[PDB]
């Protein structure tokens, strides 16, 4: 019943005291955070409190969309020796700091995601050459489907790959994806290995990567410029915004204190120093 | 009335009983007492084995030595208890297996010693590596130290043999080993053994994972890390030392899918 | 639905419990045929394209 938008408990008036009750004392040893209120130690007047936690509820903490990647595509001239670059990005929040740290506060979570795609383009060669408005395709290849090979092979016939066709110069594109985990919650951390090295086998085939699980494998996104070759080369970038919605979490962990290094929890040398200098005696 | 102390506790599971006089009460992690897999959240279809008493009993891991140079110690579950009688056995003979735990970290000094040990129960305790060139590379053997456990260190030392890398952990203490500030560690279920007050810690952890039941040999659920909050000093003594012993205990454990015995290359 | 360790499936195997015995003047080597299928509790999800066909050009 107590919703997020409820007023915090009104602080009671309390006067002088000389009793055997000891509020003030604890023994953090138990592990219990001593639960005192202002009125417990000092004298308080009555106060009708109006502040509510409404803007810090799990929902609101993740309520902002966030950049997750920068995918590069381009459409060079047909005369060019280099091949028309189509980008393929594996879907993982771990590619950028920002969302990851916000997600790390929790061991597990269930969240239906909403993706937004802002696509910006530009010329490269200093030619007063033109280019007609381009049309992009963002194809979601789920784990195991054939990943595109050429900017123009069959794979793009999207028989079943849910795709999006975005014309440039229009409002950014957006799609909703429900919770797609193979579990009951997405694992932000996986302690263990996929393969158990067996006693009657080669170490090679018995070896995997620590903290690498399928739990967080979700296929790739394929992006290409649909318009064919154009005399004047035009590169473009596709920024992907992810905003977790209908979110819920489990088990708090301490926030990441030193610069992240790679997909694991691992850290690099030099970066292991977070706090600064300050004196024990200077306020 | 009958002087029942929150210092005098008695834990009993299976054929063992651990009493205690200087306890700091006990913590039931997250406020959920362990329990058997429900039918609402059941998953695998075959009948589940419930070893009960044959498994629900206090096993004692090997004791460690607490000194001034002790930086910390760490143990994974069910890992550590992989050689513990039937629970050790029932662990290898199944694909799936969920289990709770009751960790009773004992360690006493005397009114003349001082210091503080924080027993933390980190769910999904992923530890950091030793090489600064290769991520998440640590090998299985190193990752699962068993009943002996591994230890924290005062400084990060990179693994420089790229010919034959050590592939082990090198967890730096103040960073709770996984690049986070220790001072915050207090968010996971825990208790502090402060030599002046108590001589044991008691955390009861209910199975916590992303699945209903999972592979034991593969994925470690819990992580018990013990770090010295306040260093150990005694008398006017240059070399004080008191031992710390962990006695863990599986609870409400159940396994599914009997097969042939798994023999893991532990070395 | 792909080759993955984490979510591997297991192994099926067939072994002679006894041995196949035949009387005299009978083919000494006979064969078996195997069939697979889903039970009533089988279900799939999240449609994707297939690797079992390709149109080159």
């Amino acid at each position, epitope marked *: 019943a107590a919703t997020s938008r409820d007023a915090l408990p009104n602080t009671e008036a309390s006067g002088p005291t000389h009793s055997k009750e000891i509020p003030a004392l604890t023994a953090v040893e138990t592990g219990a955070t001593n639960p005192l209120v202002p009125s417990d130690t000092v004298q308080t007047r009555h106060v009708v409190q109006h502040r509510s936690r409404s803007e810090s509820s799990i929902e609101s903490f993740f309520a902002r969309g966030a950049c997750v990647t920068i995918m590069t595509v381009d459409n060079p001239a047909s005369t060019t020796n280099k091949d028309k670059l189509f*980008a*393929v*990005w594996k879907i993982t929040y771990k590619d950028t700091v920002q969302l990851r740290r916000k997600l790390e506060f929790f061991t597990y979570s269930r969240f239906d995601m909403e993706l937004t795609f802002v696509v910006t383009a530009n010329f490269t060669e200093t030619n007063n050459g033109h280019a007609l408005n381009q049309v992009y395709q963002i194809m979601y290849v789920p784990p195991g489907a054939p990943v595109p090979e050429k900017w123009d092979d069959y794979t793009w016939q999207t028989s079943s790959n849910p795709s999006i066709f975005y014309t440039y110069g229009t409002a950014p594109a957006r799609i909703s994806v429900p919770y797609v985990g193979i579990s009951n919650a997405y694992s932000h951390f996986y302690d263990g290995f996929s393969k158990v090295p067996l006693k009657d086998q080669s170490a*090679a085939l018995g070896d995997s*990567l620590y903290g690498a*699980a399928s739990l967080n*494998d979700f296929g790739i996104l394929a992006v290409r410029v649909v318009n064919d070759h154009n005399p004047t080369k035009v590169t473009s970038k596709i920024r992907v915004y992810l905003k977790p919605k209908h979110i819920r979490v489990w088990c708090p962990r301490p926030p990441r204190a030193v610069a992240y290094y790679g*997909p694991g929890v691992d850290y690099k040398d030099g970066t292991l120093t977070p706090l600064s200098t300050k004196d024990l005696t200077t306020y | 009335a009958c002087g029942y102390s929150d210092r005098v506790l008695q834990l009993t599971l299976g054929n063992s009983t651990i009493t205690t006089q200087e306890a700091a009460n006990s913590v039931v992690a997250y406020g959920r007492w362990p329990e058997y897999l429900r039918d609402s959240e059941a998953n695998p279809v075959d009948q589940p084995t419930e070893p009960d008493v044959a498994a629900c009993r206090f096993y004692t891991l090997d004791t460690v030595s607490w000194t001034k140079e002790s930086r910390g110690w760490w143990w994974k579950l069910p890992d550590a208890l992989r050689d513990m009688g039937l629970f050790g056995q029932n662990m290898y003979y199944h694909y799936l297996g969920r289990s709770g735990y009751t960790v009773h970290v004992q360690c006493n000094a005397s009114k003349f010693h001082q210091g503080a040990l924080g027993v933390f129960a980190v769910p999904e305790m992923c530890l950091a590596g030793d090489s600064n060139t*290769t991520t998440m590379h640590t090998s299985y053997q190193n990752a699962n130290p068993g009943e002996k456990g591994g230890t924290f260190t005062g400084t990060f030392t990179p693994d420089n043999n*790229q010919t034959s890398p050590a592939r082990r952990f090198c967890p730096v203490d103040y960073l709770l080993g996984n690049g986070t500030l220790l001072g915050n560690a207090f968010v996971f279920p825990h208790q502090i053994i402060n030599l002046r007050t108590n001589n044991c810690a008691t955390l009861v952890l209910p199975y916590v994972n992303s699945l209903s039941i999972d592979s034991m040999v593969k994925h470690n659920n819990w992580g018990i890390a013990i770090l010295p909050l306040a260093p150990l000093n005694f008398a006017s003594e240059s070399s004080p030392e008191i031992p710390i012993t962990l006695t863990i205990a599986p609870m409400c454990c159940e396994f599914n899918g009997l097969r042939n015995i798994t023999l893991p290359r532990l070395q | 639905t792909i080759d993955d360790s984490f979510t591997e499936g297991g192994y099926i195997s067939v072994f002679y419990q006894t041995r196949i015995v035949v009387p005299l003047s009978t083919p000494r080597e006979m064969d078996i045929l195997g069939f697979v299928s889903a039970c009533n509790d089988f279900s799939v999800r999240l449609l994707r394209d297939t690797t079992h066909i390709e149109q080159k050009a």
Partner: nanobody
Amino acid sequence: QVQLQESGGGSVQAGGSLRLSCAASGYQYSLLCMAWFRQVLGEGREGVAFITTYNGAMRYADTVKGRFTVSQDKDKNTVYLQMNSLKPEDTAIYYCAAGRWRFGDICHEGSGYNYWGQGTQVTVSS
């Protein structure tokens, strides 16, 4: 298709040290399992050392192990092969293959390798 632009052979004598560079053209990220090889003149076409793109873990061939070290240029998509102690028998047409990957499984020889390199030959004179 992934392209593996290799570089750059030569027949220096015993004990020598050269190196091969091979690009991801290609989309080096989580996929490719950049491996090394050398075709022992018609005998002959063995796998030298192989690196994992995702983590940077190397494995070598029982022959090359130690002398040869596989290096990785993550950001500029190149995988090197510091060919050390080049002895006369280090005469063979070198290779650079790169397959895909198993999410978490280490890049080994029994695993890859879908795509092929140029095959730039390095010979060790006698």
